[PDB]
Ligand SMILES: C=C=CCNCCCC/N=C/C=C(\C)N1c2cc(C)c(C)cc2N(C[C@H](O)[C@H](O)[C@H](O)COP(=O)(O)OP(=O)(O)OC[C@H]2O[C@@H](n3cnc4c(N)ncnc43)[C@H](O)[C@@H]2O)c2[nH]c(=O)[nH]c(=O)c21
Ligand SMILES: C=C=CCNCCCC/N=C/C=C(\C)N1c2cc(C)c(C)cc2N(C[C@H](O)[C@H](O)[C@H](O)COP(=O)(O)OP(=O)(O)OC[C@H]2O[C@@H](n3cnc4c(N)ncnc43)[C@H](O)[C@@H]2O)c2[nH]c(=O)[nH]c(=O)c21
Ligand SMILES: [Cl-]
Ligand SMILES: [Cl-]
Ligand SMILES: [Cl-]
């Protein structure tokens with residue numbers, strides 16, 4: 001009864017692939033989702049009336065962006081200053097920050113002009129910071145205390161740059177509404193929840209592919225679209241494919257990077273922050289000399305660059321939204337809500353110079369790195385890798401027996417929701433063209 | 443190329459089944475063993491020259507016993523008093539122990555005569571102890587202190603009875619020598635080590651059975667002989683069979699018992715025990731009133747009835763051999779060698795009344811309950827179950843697609859090495875008869 005297609009993952013890529021096939025008259029389609037939910041790294045949570053994003057937060061502008069189009073078409077779509085604080089409870093003056101910002105931006109451009117691959121982009125940052133460090137050290141007119149603060153702001157910027165990897169729209173109702181739109185069309189029977197896959201068996205001798213589920217169910221199939229993260233692949237490629245993947249694809253899985261980026265929300269009964277403060281930015285004065293990329297686990301909290309104040313209060317309450325990227329996010333994920341809440345409260349006391357700040361009423365946080373269905377937040381082309389690795393990863397296996405979809409497999413829109421969606425449509429489109437060729441040949 | 447037979451487990455049952463098939467001209471035979479070793483619950487360890495059994499220790503006499511025959515044919519086969527000590531470092535006099543022993547044996551026989559199923563055997567113990575407790579309490583001539591000791595000896599006996607479940611020969615070279623004899627004949631390629639099975643798939647549409655390995659290898663087969671313990675079945679039957687087992691067999695798996703019985707060996711530099719002492723038997727004076735079947739985890743050590751002195755010293759060194767049965771053995775298995783060694787040393791100080799006993803030089807111990815390939819030491823017909831459950835467990839699935847072997851599936855020799863061996867030959871014999879019928883019919 002037609003070709004049997006199995007999609008692994010009910011994130012944007014898996015749902016987009018499933019929908020595209022169903023719309024082109026593929027009846028025998030089943031989505032195997034590991035978790036109890038759809039959307040994957042799109043995860044919207046409601047604390048009372050308020051809606052908080054634990055994954056994807058922003059749509060990256062654009063009319064061509066098919067997630068903007070989805071949202072706008074269904075009508076889902078829609079202050080003050082960054083307060084820089086020192087670890088001895090002092091605010092850094094406007095003029096110091098503004099002076100640093102301009103020095104950094106001037107030196108970043110003189111560097112970026114001098115250089116556009118992965119190793120190029122990274123080295124702009126590295127040589128910018130060392131030149132900025134020189135210009136501060138060698139400035140004859142700045143006093144000692146001011147130089148120590150500005151040098152520590154290099155380390156604060158470095159932490160902000162560590163989370164960065166791509167004008168910007170939010171969905172106040174929840175990013176999960178966009179996910180629910182894609183899934184509307186899909187019949188109920190198609191999406192199997194709580195159904196993690198253990199291994200894909202290909203080059204077999206009615207069904208040349210067998211999907212081995214964790215619950216030991218064997219599902220024969222003609223084609224499999226794999227949408228699991230680069231994190232899942234890195235951890236499981238050795239056991240997840242029989243026979244082994246082509247060595248080019250194994251190399252791609254090794255060379256491409258995936259970052260753990262977790263969100264920390266702190267709900268307070270009353271606010272303790274000035275009405276001029278959009279954010280609290282944490283500058284540790286003892287980090288003037290350090291070039292620290294990864295902190296030891298005891299100092300995981302130091303990788304938090306600061307906290308944004310959510311606006312408006314009536315929508316969200318009095319909530320601080322922090323980000324933590326890298327191995328320090330994995331350490332954070334191992335700690336209890338009380339242990340995390342306590343350390344963030346301690347930090348905010350030290351940085352505000354106000355020892356009477358109460359522990360937050362509630363705490364909400366993501367755990368993407370430790371989750372065996374994600375093992376990270378988003379992909380990037382790493383200091384070593386290229387766009388060739390993304391093409392290698394995306395490349396189907398012989399017979400289109402296994403196709404590779406997901407954000408990581410998208411050449412220009414990797415680490416985005418639209419990248420995921422479009423990577424799904426690409427692989428669905430690949431099958432459609434293959435079965436058009438059989439129609440045209442015969 | 444002939445019928446494809448897969449044996450799960452390279453214990454006595456699996457090896458016996460494999461050998462029997464190979465000897466009757468079954469060429470296409472493979473044994474999948476989870477662990478890196480053969481023998482299963484036969485496990486011999488050498489500390490220097492000495493050989494210590496962590497599993498099966500004794501051959502239960504007999505000429506008909508095929509393990510006696512195996513040993514004797516290859517020439518592998520071959521003091522003092524039990525010292526009863528109180529928890530206040532006092533030895534219980536010969537006459538007190540002898541008086542208790544006779545009271546127990548007299549009252550056990552008067553009860554056993556009055557009653558022979560599982561619920562019958564257990565109830566003999568229960569009504570014996572309560573009658574003994576009465577006869578002690580109501581004895582007009584015994585003093586108070588003596589009654590408290592004798593009543594606490596009921597609890598010490600109760601612990602010894604908790605490990606009991608079946609004249610007696612040892613193999614000084616190692617019980618593993620008997621295992622190695624069976625395996626001699628078996629070609630190298632047949633036994634796959636480090637190869638745990640995850641699920642057996644039966645009622646399929648060239649190979650009506652698929653064995654799903656933990657490493658995700660799918661092995662087509664005509665017949666599967668399952669030799670894993672009742673412990674493994676109890677824990678994994680829900681996931682280990684597709685489709686589900688007959689409800690009669692599920693009920694049998696539930697109703698039949700498997701006990702965790704672990705061995706503790708303590709090697710001392712010098713002995714601290716009298717040359718008259720074969721064993722140190724631990725009587726806790728505060729257990730006069732208790733009828734405790736299972737201790738809380740904090741008091742796991744109380745389930746140790748005492749320690750045997752191994753003889754002769756030149757063979758073994760100065761070693762104490764203790765046994766611990768039940769949930770208290772699972773608690774023991776979670777503790778470190780230092781933590782276990784320390785508590786046993788503390789006990790021996792309290793019970794000898796000698797506070798200067800050094801911590802043992804070495805410690806050796808089994809961990810059958812926590813081991814996912816055993817989850818217990820041996821089967822028994824439980825207070826509720828019958829020999830009908832053993833027949834239900836032993837019963838093959840339709841087509842002899844799956845056969846059930848192992849100690850637990852043997853009607854009279856369950857919980858023994860010969861039971862395991864003979865249960866293997868039974869299932870091998872079952873296949874041989876099935877393929878003799880096809881030879882005679884056609
Ligand atoms: C002043 C000032 C400061 C402000 N600075 C401005 C800078 C802002 C720059 N933007 C940042 C954006 C972030 C951080 N954004 C962000 C933040 C965070 C915290 C995250 C986690 C992500 C993001 N991204 C990336 C996307 O979320 C991601 O690419 C896609 O959802 C993935 O889709 P998929 O490929 O289908 O995989 P999926 O994993 O979703 O689905 C696969 C499924 O497979 C399942 N699975 C796994 N194993 C399985 C198995 N064995 N068997 C069966 N199933 C299995 C699994 O359960 C899943 O359901 C963002 N994207 C975007 O558009 N906007 C954004 O803001 C962000
Ligand atoms: C004065 C005074 C005091 C003295 N008192 C005297 C009283 C003495 C009474 N006797 C007591 C005897 C004991 C306690 N004895 C004793 C003590 C102790 C500590 C133990 C642990 C046992 C015993 N017994 C029982 C036997 O050891 C047991 O029945 C068989 O070896 C099991 O064989 P099998 O069926 O093949 O299973 P196996 O489990 O061996 O093999 C199955 C294989 O399957 C493998 N497997 C599991 N899962 C798998 C998967 N998923 N995939 C693939 N493979 C997988 C696994 O790794 C194994 O290798 C004894 N027997 C005996 O004859 N003499 C004895 O003394 C004792
Ligand atoms: Cl199945
Ligand atoms: Cl990482
Ligand atoms: Cl395979």
Ligand SMILES: [Cl-]
Nearest residue numbers: 701702768769
């Ligand atoms: Cl138990």
